[PDB]
Amino acid sequence: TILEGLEAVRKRPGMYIGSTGERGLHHLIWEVVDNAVDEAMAGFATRVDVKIHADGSVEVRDDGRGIPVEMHATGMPTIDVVMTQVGVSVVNALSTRLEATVLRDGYEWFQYYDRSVPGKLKQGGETKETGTTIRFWADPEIFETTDYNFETVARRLQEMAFLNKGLTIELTDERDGKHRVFHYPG
Template sequence: MGLFGIGPCVANALSSRLTAEVRREGVRWMQEYERGVALAPPGAAGPAIGAGTTIAFRPDDTVFGPAQCEFDVLAECFRTLAFLNRGLDITLTDEGAPGGPRVARFRFPGGVRDFVGALGVRSGAPFRSDVLGFEREVPRMAGTIEVALQWCDSREEDVRGFTNSLATGTGTHEAGLREGVAAAIDAYARARGLQTAADCIGEGLTAVVSVTLDDRDFVDFARREPGGDAVRACVAQAVREYLGAWFEAHPEQAAAVITPVLRAAARN
C-alpha cells in the first residue's frame, strides 16, 4: 500500500469503505478505498500539524452482515495495547451512545508493570511482593524482552505472553519465563540448603512477558509462537539473572515469595 504501509490491508479488504490519512513532514496525504480497491492514487490534501496516521472504515455488511462494535470489547483490546506499548495514548469514543458520547482513554507509563499491577488488583489476593520487572534488548534474538512479575497469596497462576503486541497461547517465551523463574528460585533456595519443586513455582505468580521481534520470526504464525529455542533461552536467561539479583537485594520479599513455594513442594 506504499505510503500507507501494509497495516490497513486486512481492514481494507473487509471494509465497504476505508479512508487512510497520513500526516508527514507538514503534508496531509489521503487515499480512499471501496471494498479494497483504491478510488484514486494518494493525494496531498493540505498542510498537517505533527505526524501520525488515521484510518477510518466501515465493515462490509456483505461479509459480516449487520455489524455493531461493542464498546467494552474494544476498550479491553485497546487497554491491553496501551499496557504493552509504554507511553502510547489511545482514546476510544462512541459518538452514538445513549445520553451522549462515551469516552475511554488508555495510557500506562509503567508498561507491563502497570499491566501486572492491574491484574493483581483484579485477583483481590494479598500481595507477597512488589511488582517487579525489566526490559532488555537482546541482539541474539534480534528483539527486546519486557517482563513484569508479582506474587500474591493464591494457589493460582496467571502468566500472559505477547509477541509484537499479539496475545499468545503457550508460546516459547512463556516457557522461557517459567524456566527463568524456576531457576532463580531454585538457586536462591539451594544456596541456603533448601530444595524446591519446579511444579510449584507458579503458585501465586502473576506475570506478563512481552517479546518484540524485529524480523517477526514466528515458528507458527497462526499460534503466534516466536522464534523457537533461541527466544526461549534468551527469556529464561534474562529472567533468571534479573530475578536472582532481585532476590539478593530484597531478602524479606524473597523469603515471602519462596517460603510458600517450599510449603507447596512439601505438600506434594
C-alpha cells in the same frame, strides 16, 4: 493479480481474520490499532485515538511517522501497496470503503478506497505534524454482525496500554457518547 488477492480475502475471510461473526468483525479494529500501536513501540507515536462512528465506521488516528506516501517501485504510492498487499489490506478487502489521511513529508495527504480500489492520492496543505488516520466501513455482506461492542474494544485497548507503558489510548463511541482514556506511566 492485486485485485485477485483482495477478492481471495472476500471469498474466504476465515483464512485471514479467523471467522465472520462478532470476533471476526472486531479483528478489523485489532489490525488497524495494532498498526498504530506498532508506531508507539517503535518510539514515534505517543497517542492512539479510536472512534466508533454512528455510521458503523471506525476511525483510528496516531501521531506516528505516517504511512509512506512516496511512489513505490511497483508503480503506485507506498500507501496503496500497504492497503492492497500487507496485513491492513485485509481490512480494506472486507470494508466497503477505507479512507486514509497521512501527515508526512511536510504535507497532509488524502486517499480513499472504494471496495479496495484506490482513488488518486491527493496532496493537501503544508504541516510539520506526522501521523496516520484510517477510517473503515466494515462490509455487511461479509460479517454476520456490524455492531462493535464498546466494552470488548475498551478491555483490549486498556490491555494494549498496559503492555505499552507511556502510550495513551482514547476510545470514543459516537453512538451513545461512551468515552474512555487508558494510560500507564512509562
